[PDB]
């Protein structure tokens with residue numbers, strides 16, 4: 001299963017890709033809004049793991065991009081972000097995120113939530 | 122959409138059913154393990170909102186019951202529980218929960234997660 005990992009802090013992104021590799025996934029990297037848009041293409045990701053605060057546009061705006069395009073609107077998105085306030089968790093979910101995980105995170109819970117979401121398609 | 126609400130603290134259960142009613146759902150109540158098993162029938166619930174610590178058996182065991190039976194294994198389950206330790210969140214998800222929410226909760230986030238899960242079927 002391919003996972004688009006969207007995260008601008010390169011050492012965190014690489015750590016996340018390692019956890020995912022070790023858990024059976026094939027991650028692909030995007031470091032900002034525009035890279036995520038461009039990287040979002042064939043071969044399609046099975047899921048998009050998405051930071052909120054990114055150069056060039058937020059992950060909220062990215063979900064709006066995904067959901068506006070009939071070709072991408074069914075691709076699951078799980079947010080993984082330092083924005084932990086209730087208002088933000090609700091905002092992410094309501095925009096279209098299938099789940100929303102806050103930093104710092106447990107690598108076991110991260111993988112468990114991704115696989116839970118993947119079970120639901 | 123029908124929601125089976127499994128929770129043994131009756132005033133919390135009733136509060137939860139109120140939030141769900143106000144948000145477009147048709148909740149049905151179960152106060153313990155055996156009631157949840159019995160209440161789990163036609164007309165099927167669209168989703169099961171499930172407390173962990175219940176008389177007669179845990180919500181973990183209930184998910185095992187659901188997943189063993191081909192007639193019920195695709196019904197989404199969201200846990201809502203005072204068991205907040207990382208180990209428990211992972212345990213719930215790995216058993217088959219589509220999401221896992223800890224008490225005390227935001228009624229906006231509760232509804233947002235239920236609808237996110239409902240979007241994924």
Ligand code: BEF
Pocket residue numbers: 051052053054080081082083103
């Ligand atoms: F920049 Be992310 F929201 F942690």
Ligand code: BEF
Pocket residue numbers: 172173174175201202203204224
């Ligand atoms: F009894 Be529940 F797990 F809050």
Ligand SMILES: [Mg+2]
Pocket residue numbers: 007008009051052053054
């Ligand atoms: Mg960031």
Ligand SMILES: [Mg+2]
Pocket residue numbers: 128129130172173174175
């Ligand atoms: Mg209980």
